[PDB]
């Protein structure tokens, strides 16, 4: 049983690991974070920053969510992230991933009291 805030942490936070993800990082992390149970989650982004830094994004630049609804916020700073993409050849229960580390501003949807990230919306390179 999982709140949206807890689901966000499980799926998208990886505060305590190195930014330069090796080629097997997503294979290991998608499994460890329960994103290969029932189905292979096709795409996922992990953020290698402190929780407080990601939570604080809810109080940074307000931007439009990709679907035009909800309240989204773009980080002031470029953060260490890793994109994970399900390989073409993969099929449940065999879930293989390509790992792509990068530094990007994150855009998250926020809600609740406390007002916290509940959805990873997008990442972008450009500031402002
Ligand atoms: Cl950083
Ligand atoms: Cl790609
Ligand atoms: Cl990518
Ligand atoms: Cl999400
Ligand atoms: Cl980009
Ligand atoms: Cl792009």
Swiss-Prot record:
The UniProt annotation puts the region (Disordered) at 5-25
The record lists the effect of residue 91 to D as: Substantially decreases binding affinity for RNH1 but maintains high conformational stability
The EC designation for this entry is 4.6.1.18
List of catalytic residues: 12, 119
Q: Where is the composition biased (Basic and acidic residues)?
A: 5-15
| Residues annotated to bind substrate | 7, 10, 41-45, 66, 85
This chain belongs to the protein called Ribonuclease pancreatic
Part of the whole protein covered:
29 to 156 of 156
